């Protein structure tokens, strides 16, 4: 496969900035979801799961085809609970029927991060919806019950190196695990709908204790009321990952700069951009626009 980026016919910066402004305004408004966490967390988890099925060996999966729209990928056990992020974005697609699915799912994520006071993520348009038979089979997204060797081996299929994996995993400060979705339960820190380096600081400063939960799975619990997945706790069991964790815990700007770069890379894997194509867009936030 080659998947060439094709701009939605006739659209420019300002059209895209209007879909962003509309996702951000609905984030403002539906602020009660998940005990007042808001939809920002489930929207960045949707943008990483439509991108994470990519395989570098044969160019299949990835954000291009918008294939989550199909039953097979939608009903994937690893995608439980994302139906909420889909439902949120659905009125927005009716308001802007020209944007592709891959471009909408992926800009949902960019919008959520920047509105949650995260860094600016450059975003590129051009994904083209592809047929139901391009839909990747289930089982390409990662297990939580595993160690640092699995994490490193997994992220190599998406060719992410160590620093990229540690920066990408800093998004687990956001939101929470939920027992009926994934067999895991609990939040990862205090500020779970603001984007900060809190995940690293909690991983280095809490007294974590291994316990089984109501699903019969293990997780790392702390006195404070927080949890960490086995795969999250892996980042301090590996000496290479641990020097990176410490760096971000001492420097939130360096974390913002590396998350920005790696999140964009994750959203654009498997896509070729012609150089006639527009430069990546930097969208303004509501606040920046006085809205």
Label each residue of 75-98 as H, E or C. Answer: CCHHHCCCHHHHHHHHHHHHHCCC
Cα 82 to Cα 52: distance, rounded to the nearest angstrom: 14
User: Which of 151, 228, 249, 267 is in the footprint of ligand HEM by CB under 6 A?
Assistant: 151
Among 53, 79, 177, 202, binds ligand HEM (CB under 6 A): 177
Using CB atoms within 10 A of its CB, is residue 37 exposed (0-12), middle (13-18) or buried (19+)? middle
**Cα atoms in the 13 Å half-sphere on the side-chain side of 127:** 27
CA 149 to chain centre: 22
Pick one of 27, 38, 45, 228: the residue that binds ligand HEM (CB under 6 A). Answer: 45
The rounded distance, in Å, linking the Cα atoms of 217 and 238 is 22
Sites for ligand HEM among residues 79-138 (CB under 6 A) = 81
Give min distance, CB of 283 to ligand HEM, in A. Answer: 18
Q: How far is the C-alpha of 247 from the C-alpha of 288, rounded, in Å?
A: 30
CB 151 to ligand HEM: min, Å = 5
Question: What is the spatial distance between Cα 178 and Cα 185, in angstroms, rounded to a whole number?
Answer: 5
Contact residue for ligand HEM among 25, 128, 144, 277 (CB under 6 A): 144
User: Would you give the binding string for ligand HEM spanning residues 231-260, x where CB under 6 A is met?
Assistant: x-----------------------------
Write down the least CB distance from residue 167 to ligand HEM, Å.
9
Q: Tell me: does residue 194 bind ligand HEM (CB under 6 A).
A: no
The yes or no reply on residue 140 touching ligand HEM (CB under 6 A) is no
Query: Could you say which of 122, 142, 186, 278 contacts ligand HEM (CB under 6 A)?
Result: 142
> Among 280, 255, 285, which residue's Cα sits nearest to residue 267?
280
Q: How far apart are CA 285 and CA 291, in angstroms?
A: 9
Contact region with ligand HEM (CB under 6 A), list: 67-75, 92-100, 178-186, 277-285:
178-186
Interaction site with ligand HEM (CB under 6 A): 41-42, 44-45, 48, 81, 142-144, 151, 168-169, 171-172, 174-178, 181-182, 184, 231
């Amino acid at each position: 496969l080659v998947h060439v980026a094709s701009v939605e016919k006739g659209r420019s910066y300002e059209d895209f900035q209007k879909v962003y402004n509309a996702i951000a305004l609905k984030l403002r408004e539906d602020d009660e979801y998940d005990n007042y966490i808001g939809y920002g967390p489930v929207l960045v988890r949707l943008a990483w799961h439509i991108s994470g099925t990519w395989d570098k060996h044969d160019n299949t999966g990835g954000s291009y085809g918008g294939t989550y729209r199909f039953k097979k990928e939608f009903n994937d056990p690893s995608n439980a609970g994302l139906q909420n992020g889909f439902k949120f974005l659905e009125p927005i697609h009716k308001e802007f029927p020209w944007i592709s699915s891959g471009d909408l799912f992926s800009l949902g994520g960019v919008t959520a991060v920047q509105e949650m006071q995260g860094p600016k993520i450059p975003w590129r348009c051009g994904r083209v919806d592809t047929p139901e038979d391009t839909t990747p089979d289930n089982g390409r997204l990662p297990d939580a019950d595993k160690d640092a060797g699995y994490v490193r081996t997994f992220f190599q299929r998406l060719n992410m190196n160590d620093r990229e994996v540690v920066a990408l995993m800093g998004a687990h400060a956001l939101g929470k695990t939920h027992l009926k979705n994934s067999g895991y339960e609990g939040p990862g820190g205090a500020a779970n709908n603001v984007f900060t380096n809190e995940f690293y600081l909690n991983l280095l400063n809490e007294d974590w204790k291994l316990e089984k939960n109501d699903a019969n799975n293990e997780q790392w619990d702390s006195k404070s009321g927080y949890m960490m997945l086995p795969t999250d706790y892996s980042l301090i069991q590996d000496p290479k990952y641990l020097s990176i964790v410490k760096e971000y815990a001492n420097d939130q700007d360096k974390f913002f700069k590396d998350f920005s770069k790696a999140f964009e890379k994750l959203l654009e894997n498997g896509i070729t951009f012609p150089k006639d194509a527009p430069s990546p867009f930097i969208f303004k936030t509501l606040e920046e626009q006085g809205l």
